[PDB]
Subunit: 281 residues, 3 copies
């Protein structure tokens, strides 16, 4: 385990075999729970910025491993972290300002900080549950067709997911975005200087028949109507919440997988906690 007592601010600061080990740990915890693994551990859920579904999933992941939780669903932040790091074995925090988790690392001492949302920048466990659901549904993170639909400019979870998928071989991307919203040039360059296929589009039915994963973000409104030529294995993903970015008539379909996607966050965060605060596996 390379992650024992590691801070986790950015998923991009991670190797591909690190991702594979995290996903394997998550699958092992999904198969047979280990509810006393993190017994006698006390973790802080410090949601400076409220996020009740992220917080509920994180705390349920902690409780599945028999840990205890203290925190707040809400002086400098430096002093707050300096004090809290003397109570707990780990700090899980969400903060409305960018770089706040990396700042917390400098005063947390021998206590690892896990980023649950750092401004609207890093949110690694969301990308981890995304990758875990992709691997869980397709059995592989290699040789896959990944359509990404919506606002691909601002939500950096999309960029983190693309960078994680590029660390595996054989994938082809499809970017559906108006124009003002579009995958920034640096990820296109990251795929070019790594030799990976990708193509912009205007609508979803343009390549509906070819996609393995359809990842949507928060005009381009999806409907079950538009899933006639879908591959049987195809899965629809959404980090949530949704309104009518995905109309409710898609929930009934076999491709609707955003609720199972959100449920897999339990195992992503469970595996991350287990890797950080435990050596043996």
């Amino acid at each position: 385990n390379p992650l024992y007592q590691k801070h986790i601010i950015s998923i991009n600061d991670l190797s591909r075999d690190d991702l594979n080990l995290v996903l394997a740990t998550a699958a092992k915890l999904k198969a047979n729970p280990q509810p006393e693994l993190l017994k006698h551990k006390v973790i802080a859920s410090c949601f400076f910025e409220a996020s009740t579904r992220t917080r509920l999933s994180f705390e349920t992941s902690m409780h599945r491993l028999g840990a205890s939780v203290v925190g707040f669903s809400d002086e400098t932040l430096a002093d707050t972290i300096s004090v809290i790091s003397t109570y707990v074995d780990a700090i899980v925090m969400r903060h409305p300002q960018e770089g706040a988790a990396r700042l917390a690392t400098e005063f947390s001492g021998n206590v690892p900080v896990l980023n649950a949302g750092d401004g609207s920048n890093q949110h690694p466990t969301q990308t981890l549950l995304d990758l875990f659901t992709i691997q869980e549904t397709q059995g592989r993170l290699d040789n896959l067709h990944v359509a990404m639909v919506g606002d691909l400019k601002y939500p950096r979870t999309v960029h983190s997911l693309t960078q994680a998928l590029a660390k595996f071989d054989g994938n082809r991307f499809y970017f559906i975005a108006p124009d003002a919203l579009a995958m920034p040039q640096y990820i296109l360059d990251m795929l070019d200087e790594k030799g990976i296929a990708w193509s912009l589009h205007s609508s979803i039915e343009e390549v509906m028949a070819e996609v393995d994963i359809l990842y949507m973000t928060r005009q381009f409104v999806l409907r079950a109507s538009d899933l006639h030529n879908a591959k049987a294995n195809m899965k629809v993903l959404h980090p949530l919440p949704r309104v009518d970015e995905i109309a409710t008539d898609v929930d009934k379909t076999p491709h609707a997988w955003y609720f199972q996607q959100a449920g897999n966050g339990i195992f992503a965060r469970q595996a991350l906690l287990a890797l950080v605060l435990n050596r043996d596996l």
Copy 2:
């Protein structure tokens, strides 16, 4: 156990032997606690509408059975329930809108929802602790005199309690209410088409000497002064909170039982949880 993995929205959707089994389970848990019964269970306390005494009693009931709690004391509600039902083993929820728990049932999947307050309509565990305290104080839920004083029009817990008491034999009711407030006609008809005694009144001392239970609701202000001709077994009940509906000079008396009544909610909710998420007893 007929209640294993059952939703509990309304107490009226329950047989009399169901009530007897719940009360027996509550008495058994009151006698010798079983603190590992619901070990490895994770329950959501989703108080969309704040209710800290109901929530504290519910969560203490969960912790008495060794369970773990995640939630919020506070996108559609449908998506919220759809996501949360993938984290937890049961959902205990209070919501300010009527029918919200029944709505949550349609997306909770294999996860039972327990209504902790659904608008100002159903609140089954309050009626359950009421019945449990009546059975605990009088040793029987049959052949009893039940005075019900105050606003008997709007709080539907009164109607649920009357319907539950009518499922047992031999009771006589006394309804003390101004005029604009009065037990709605449908419960009077429920008692008529079941042959049960009941009588309206204007004051409490009119039949103070005859009552076994004096249940008060939220001009008709009670005082210890008015308890001279009380039966020795008589018990005063109030779902709480009170102000001077019950003056403080009654707290000292042996008939004051609303605090023990509220304390019995621990065992009512403990028994309900044990019945839902466990088969063997």
Copy 3:
């Protein structure tokens, strides 16, 4: 154990050997944790007045002893305590009004109340962690030089700490305060009618070379610059939060001990809980 099932409103209602037993229990729990000591115990963290660092430390102390926590980080208070005392084994409460904990004692029955902040008056566990850190750093609570700098008029934790230190022998105090702020006359009289040394001052470097403990409160701004003639064992203490009462350039120094001080609150509150809800040690 004289404290079994005792209310703890004021630290001044305590003997010196009581303090020594509490500190010994805290050191024993710091040495080898006893995480199942208060198993099957349920405690209420009733923070009527929000105090997230006091609350987080209290709840972490509860969880270190394997207890479970219910409460609120926020009808009369009398009825609230009367109801809550039927759920839980102990009540830890902070309330914005003076004497609220002593009031809660009158309705808590066989449930001990532990004061986590009673108005801006009593806050015994803060004084307990102060004494524990002094004993931990100097190895003794006797024959020590204690400088107390800042507003020594209003924060009654300073008065409680001075009264606790006066219950031991051989200490000399130094009071640094503007003029409008100054240690009230009654503590000066408490030291006079007990024969203990103390001296007022105008600045810190006046007796910087002689002090064992430098306790600061919430013009008199400290800097690392002013620690050249410090004793090697000297420790800087602050109940927190701080702004520039202690400039950040002191954090690096070996005398900075306010974060370790706050961390010792875990063990102070752990020991208090263990003493109250347990007989054997």
